[PDB]
Amino acid sequence: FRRTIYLAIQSSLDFEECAHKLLKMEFPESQTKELCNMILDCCAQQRTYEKFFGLLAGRFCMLKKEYMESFEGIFKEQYDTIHRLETNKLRNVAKMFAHLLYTDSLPWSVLECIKLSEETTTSSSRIFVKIFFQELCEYMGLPKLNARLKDETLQPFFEGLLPRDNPRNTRFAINFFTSIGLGGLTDELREHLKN
Amino acid sequence: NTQELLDLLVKCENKIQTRIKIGLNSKMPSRFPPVVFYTPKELGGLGMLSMGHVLIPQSDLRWSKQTDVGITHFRSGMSHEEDQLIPNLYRYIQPWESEFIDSQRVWAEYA
């Protein structure tokens, strides 16, 4: 099954036909978690990130809710085990998930998986989040990313990402987003350190 | 993005295969299954690279001349055995936009 998904991707030049060919084979719903998973893995094998895989995954996210939920699961699964990946495969998965987040194929809710601390994050995880946010910034821009990143309806989700409880973690995450080049996102944290 | 080319490429791939079959004094498709063409030269085949086994995207003529609409149908492209899926040459090439983004990032990091 993994082989036939892979040959279907490589045989189709455009993203639209790739989706058409996968839908025409009519897998059962029990397969769908694997199919989405395969679409990610094929994406990671490339040299550079190619828009094809982000668009193919997005079209699957718009067709049925099953695929969208399944990609939400894969984000958490992949982020848990990021240290297994080589650096290119890591960069491609980061850019693909940034693509899904930017085009709103995927809820921002998944972003509660990420928890920033000295002891919570491994080094590869820190690189993953760097590429992810550096990329989301590049698509949206700082004002847009700020506007979406501090929001009333998404307040509970980002608390692991923007750690208000512990001053040591708050100083860590401020330093983290600063060294990336996304200093602006830290400013409301800085005030919370001052108070 | 150019549909004229995709039509032209399907025609051209079929002309090359048909000229090889003419050279062998036969055009019967079952003496010449695609394995004899697509197999790499390291295994004894001709090793031709493929572009014409794609589905060609199409929309209604009267509106597509008039504006840019969505792909609503597909035409076939070259015949193959329906379980088999010949690889596409375009897939194994990075797009130029991807290459330009990557290039500046790589050079910046080298400095």
Partner: peptide
Amino acid sequence: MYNGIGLPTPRGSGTNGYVQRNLSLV
């Protein structure tokens, strides 16, 4: 040529001219 889609003749195209609808429309 049904519904304004397809080749008026499949002859010299290099293909059988079978046309199906796009299944990934939203």
